[PDB]
Every structure is written in C-alpha cells, then in structure tokens.
C-alpha cells in the first residue's frame, strides 16, 4: 500500500540522504536532508555559493513570519535564520499538507556542501532538543497532530549515487527480509537506545556496557559514521586490526586521516571482520544483535582505483549509530510504541559470502544499568 513512497530518497555517498519537500504557495520544492539526530526543519532561504535554489518567503502567500531568530549548532557546522510557518507537503510521502514551523536559513558555517544537491534539513527527533526551545513543534509532531498519519516512520538507506525509502505512517514489507527486532527508545529527545554488548567477528570486546553508552547512544541518519566513545573506539580499532592482520594498514587509516585504494573490483572485503552491536530488547533480560559488514564501515571516496575511508570514528558525545549502521538495515522509528525496529535491508550492500544480519534473542542480564544518568 506504501508503494508510492518507495525510492523517495536520494543522495551522494557520505553526504546524507534527502527527500523532496514542497513548501509554501505557489509550490516551492526543495531537497531536504533527513536527520533523525536533530529536531529542526530548516531550509536555505538566501543565496549561498553551494545552493542552486532556496526558499523565497516573499513569494509564498501562506508564509507567516514568527518574528524570532533561530540558531542551530551541529557537530562541525551551524546556521542562523528566521522562524516562520508555511504549508508543507512531501510529494512522494503521505497524501497530506500541514502547516509546519520552518527555519529560513540566511547565514551558515560549514553546513551546506558543495554539490550535494540538498538545500535544507528535516530534524525528525523530539521537541526536547529543538531550538530555540522545546516549544517549537518539530515537523513530525505537526504531521501527527494535524492529520490521520500514524505516529511512525521507517528508513531504508541504500548505500553505494545512493537512494532509499522513507515510509511515513507505516512499514513496507518489500524493504526488508527476516524478522523485525525492536529496542526501546530510552527517552524521547534524540532517538536514544542502549547498547549492551559489542563483538568483532564474533569476539566480545569485553568492555563494561556503561562505556558503550557514555554519555548516550543514538540513532542518527544525519551522521555518516559509526562514532564511538574514545575508550570504546580505541578497543574496537585494536580488535579490528587483529582480525584483519593478514593485511597491514597505516595507523592513520584507522584514524580516517589516510585512505587506502584498491584496483577497481579487487577490494578484499573478506579480510575485514563483521561488527555486531547487541541492543536491549523488549522483554526483560532479552537482547538481539545487529551485524554489519566492511561494505558498511569502509566507505568509497569518489578512475581505475577504488579508494576507501574507515568510517568508524571517535566521539566525545556518546555512540552515534549513523549511516554506517543504518545502511545495513530497514529501521523502523515506531514513535507510537516508543521503540526502534531493525531488520535486514533488502537493499544493503553485501557479497556472495556474507550478509548483514539481525539475530536474536540472546540472554543479557542487568541491561538497565548500561544507561548513563546525570
């Protein structure tokens, strides 16, 4: 029944995934990066060297100025702009139109990307982390409040020109194989989850699970990498190196400071290990695990040479399950039931020998203690 929403995402590898959104009246359609890691809907609204088009408020009869500025800082970049509301539809999304808050971006720093094809960002997380404060209703909240659309969306991010699907209001079964396994949303701010165990090629990293979630773990479609707290990152690299020891790589490769390239079509995927994260399940003492391949964590950087960047990196703000994780899976953001589902993606990049996996149940004790508290 959701067929018209299939293949509604596009992107360039490593530059996020975007969906078309139509704003204002008469219609102004823009490409909008989908970000489960923030909660502001914002669009370029003035010329920028990296923008080929932008929102023109004076041409929208339905634009309402909120007479208030807004600023959002991200990990490296930031933008400043002006708040208002306008009519918004997603032409390859649900068949509704809502009046939503929109931040019109007038200035920015290291936000837009040269040649990315996107012109704005759709923050799909919860009001608690919206700027300027939690009173600025996020887009998805407006969608659910104003319409019949069920309080759920799902993302199938298909890695490498990338594509995928954002199904809004439900789940499409053509997008995954096997079973969906759910982890609780710990708290409605970011999409926060609890990681309870980590394995490299089946070998337990053997760290206290409190390290994996210090100070939070989140599912973030607007971040390319799998980002890990420093102690966890260091242990993971040590283990990944040991597992791939038949080949030698410079220290800088593991730090993302050096690329390694193979002649077209010869990448020895088989010499790199799979990586598993166990997540808290829906039943007491029950967990499940998601497993990704080097096809997910070694990312192509665009001749006759295939160059790759190691896309697991260090974080000082907790674990971030970015595209590196999401590209293996169909991920269901079941806001109505405060849970996130994972299943093997029908589109994920793999080979004849290994596939990404979602497996369970396992027995894991004292999972509640894994989470960070202030």
């Amino acid at each position: 029944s959701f067929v018209e929403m299939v293949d509604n995402l596009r992107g360039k590898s490593g530059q996020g995934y975007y969906v078309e959104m139509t704003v204002g009246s008469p219609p102004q359609t823009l490409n909008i990066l989908v970000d489960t890691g923030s909660s502001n809907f914002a669009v370029g609204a003035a010329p920028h060297p990296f923008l080929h088009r932008y929102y023109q408020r004076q041409l929208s009869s339905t634009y309402r100025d909120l007479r208030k500025g807004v600023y959002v800082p991200y990990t490296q970049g930031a933008w400043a702009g002006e708040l208002g509301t306008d009519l918004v539809s997603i032409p390859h999304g649900p068949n509704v139109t809502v009046r939503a808050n929109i931040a019109a971006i007038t200035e920015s720093d290291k936000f837009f990307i040269n040649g990315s094809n996107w012109e704005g960002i759709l923050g799909l997380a919860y009001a608690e982390i919206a700027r300027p404060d939690d009173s600025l209703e996020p887009f998805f909240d407006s969608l659910v409040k104003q319409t019949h659309v069920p309080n759920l969306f799902s993302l199938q991010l298909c890695g490498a020109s990338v594509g995928g699907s954002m199904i809004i209001g439900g789940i499409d079964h053509s997008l995954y194989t096997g079973s969906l396994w759910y982890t609780p949303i710990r708290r409605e701010w970011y999409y926060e989850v609890i990681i309870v165990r980590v394995e490299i090629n089946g070998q337990d990293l053997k760290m206290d699970c409190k390290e994996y979630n210090y100070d939070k773990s989140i599912v973030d479609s607007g971040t390319t990498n799998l980002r890990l707290p420093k102690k966890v990152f260091e242990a993971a690299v040590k283990s990944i190196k040991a597992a791939s020891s038949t080949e030698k790589f410079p220290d800088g490769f593991w730090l993302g400071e050096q690329l390694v390239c193979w002649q077209a079509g010869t990448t020895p995927w088989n010499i790199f290990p799979v990586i598993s994260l166990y997540l808290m399940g829906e039943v007491t003492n029950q967990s499940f695990r998601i497993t990704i391949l080097p096809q997910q964590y070694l990312r192509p950087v665009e001749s006759q040479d295939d160059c790759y960047k190691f896309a697991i990196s260090q974080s000082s703000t907790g674990t971030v399950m970015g595209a590196v994780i999401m590209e293996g899976f169909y991920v269901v953001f079941d806001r109505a039931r405060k849970r996130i589902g994972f299943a093997v993606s029908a589109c994920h990049v793999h080979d004849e020998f290994r596939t990404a996996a979602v497996e369970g149940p396992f027995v894991t004790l004292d999972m509640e203690d894994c989470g960070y508290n202030i």
């Binding site: 490593g14 530059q15 890691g37 909660s39 800082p73 971040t223 390319t224 990498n225």
Partner: peptide, 7 residues
Amino acid sequence: XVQFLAX
C-alpha cells in the same frame, strides 16, 4: 562526511 546536533 556529514555530521548532523551539538550535544
């Protein structure tokens, strides 16, 4: 790459 909220 992209590295989307500060915090």
